[PDB]
Amino acid sequence: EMIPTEEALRIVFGVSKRLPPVIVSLYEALGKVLAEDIRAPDPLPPYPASVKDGYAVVASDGPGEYPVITESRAGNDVTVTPGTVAYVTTGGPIPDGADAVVQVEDTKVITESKRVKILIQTKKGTDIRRVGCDIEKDATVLTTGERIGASEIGLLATAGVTMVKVYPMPIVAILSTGDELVEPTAGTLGRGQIRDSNRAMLVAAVMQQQCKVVDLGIVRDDRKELEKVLDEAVSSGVDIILTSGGVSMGDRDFVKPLLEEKGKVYFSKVLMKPGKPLTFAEIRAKPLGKTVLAFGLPGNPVSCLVCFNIFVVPTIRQLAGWTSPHPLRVRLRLQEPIKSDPIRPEFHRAIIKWKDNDGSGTPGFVAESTGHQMSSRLLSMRSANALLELPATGNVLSAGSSVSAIIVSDISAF
Amino acid sequence: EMIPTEEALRIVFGVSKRLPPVIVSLYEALGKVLAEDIRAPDPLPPYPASVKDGYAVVASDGPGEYPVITESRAGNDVTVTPGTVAYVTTGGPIPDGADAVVQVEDTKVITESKRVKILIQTKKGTDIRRVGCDIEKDATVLTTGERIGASEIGLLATAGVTMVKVYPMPIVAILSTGDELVEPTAGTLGRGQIRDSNRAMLVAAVMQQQCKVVDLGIVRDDRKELEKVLDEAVSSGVDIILTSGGVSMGDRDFVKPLLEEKGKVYFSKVLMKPGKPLTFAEIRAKPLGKTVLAFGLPGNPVSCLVCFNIFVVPTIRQLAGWTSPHPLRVRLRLQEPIKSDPIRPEFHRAIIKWKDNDGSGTPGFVAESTGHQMSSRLLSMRSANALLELPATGNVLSAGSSVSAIIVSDISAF
Ligand SMILES: [Mg+2]
Ligand SMILES: [Mg+2]
């Protein structure tokens, strides 16, 4: 009853629908996806602006000594005739009659009225931004579907847009279920108790996705309270519910029965390593009516994060309006021998480093293994930035064979 | 008087010193660098825990029918003898006398007291996490110098650390100087006015670096107010001052004279394209005494962001305690013909996409040019995630030659 991972997210990509757009402020638009076309209301520059510090001249007059008629520093709104020059700084408006601008280190100084000598001859239009040189009027400078970075903020500011129409981020509710879970603030542990590490992990994992987290806390293994928390969640306005634990084969695992009771489950077992259990349900809020997506993530720590990175991250990007929600996939060569599982494809976590020499004798990517891949050993996720997509061959891949990998974190490194 | 870029940041890397560590909360520790060693106070698991849902058995008894003595679900703290089995779920404590755990789909059901039939024979220690299986007691699970991601949050929660010793982020003050600058909220522009796009750009650029921004606003081209803003900045507790504009050859550019007056300037002209002007000064606060770093970024929009990505981002990472503050550098092949400047090396911005086939017939990176590289055309920074490091050869590199590139944004893409 296991669904392949390719079909698994094919279902999610078919059920998840992009969120309605919202108006936000300029800084609130950082990282979000543009939901409208931006047109510049005036050109840039809206006036002939000097590119270099120096003097606005007539190209015909050529080199020689000339008087400085007026001055036109960046700030103010007189013409120049053949035989006179005007002093300008960068950004300054060019007066009428000027054909070009000579630099200042291409001029000489030369106590009443001042005169300046021009050492070179300039072709017409030298060091001058014509009106609309960089941005023309009413032109599209940012288009729908673009992700707002720092430069796109600078373009919005150039055009005067401080209120932007964007697709918002999904609100995410997160909870843990386990009768053995205690808060991480707990000091000495009692018999059969462990601290709750999946919740704080998912909270931070969603925080990195710039989504609003709503911390529903620890829930015990009982149907009544687990239902109360679920009914609280969907009615609070959340878009995605993230459940950790209570989705296995035990007789107190009420996540699958409660999801299929309140909505429509699409799968509960996935051909994965790790993370054989993975429940994905569609729930409907009953108020403004809206559809809520629910991920019953497995309770094992490394299994929880892995399912988050492969099935929740694209779901978040798709609700936020990304055109390419899928993660970056790269081909790399192995740095050490590693065996694969024969039954299900193993998402082996590795540390990816770019090298100016590998894959053969060319520059490419390499990846060393993090160690043991136990579903409970969270030390395998430590400093892991890649996810090796290993086939279910059961063989041993040599320290040089090429495989496929998913980028789950920014490499940076050296 | 131009300093090469390699020597330029060699100075910055020599002047910038890592910040003193601060205690923060668990969620406040996301993204920051660990300034202490974390040791687990108890092992994980602190008790023998069942890996699979099923029954704890004696390996010697083998297959057959057996009674279910007690039940041990995840939660509670009776022994089992050869001939009896105990029902356990995942996470449950294993009673005394059990050697292994059989799965539940490897058992049969079989109305008074219940009996269960074991279909298979298990080797000793099957599906059982011994005490400390994943994390041993007093072991280092996170070490100094590590960047706290989502999984490192999960490890901190496992160990009970909710107050962490980390290196903080630098506080960054940002300001613009220009007598032609108006706020981006301005509607119809007057004669000689442009909206201030560098400030909002730098604010967002620093926001992406998870640093605290202090918006000092627009400052006119005059020495008195520009000094008042600088004296306000260093006295407010800031660690880095980011200035935009007023650092060129004009006669109202007071950033260089005021920086060298209040501190020690290390360079003012850099062999760069774009961004020939780039002033870096060291200022000292006069109170707890502290040293402030000042970047006089050039006023041209694309020139401002480029200097930010190459000289400010590593300075931020070094103050925050990174061991590899330098950006990721990758070798890629060109997708189109492009000419280089003969005098200074040009940092040409490109759109980098990973392809399963290029550089030859192998998988690698490719990069297409963004278009015109004018220092004032901010449309060249649009959707640019890479920075081509072009040599000062002045030749034309064919649509297939390999060059060096700096990753300034997460590729993602397809
Ligand atoms: Mg459980
Ligand atoms: Mg200026």
From Swiss-Prot, chains A, B:
The keyword Transferase applies. Transmembrane segments: none annotated. Residues 5-414 are annotated as: MPT Mo-transferase. One of its GO terms (molecular function) is molybdopterin adenylyltransferase activity. Inhibited by copper and tungsten. Its EC number is 2.10.1.1, 2.7.7.75. It catalyses: adenylyl-molybdopterin + molybdate = Mo-molybdopterin + AMP + H(+); molybdopterin + ATP + H(+) = adenylyl-molybdopterin + diphosphate. In the N-terminal section; belongs to the MoaB/Mog family. Catalyzes two steps in the biosynthesis of the molybdenum cofactor. In the first step, molybdopterin is adenylated. Subsequently, molybdate is inserted into adenylated molybdopterin and AMP is released. The G domain: homotrimer or homohexamer. The E domain: homodimer. This is Molybdopterin biosynthesis protein CNX1. It comes from Arabidopsis thaliana. The lineage of its organism: Eukaryota, Viridiplantae, Streptophyta, Embryophyta, Tracheophyta.
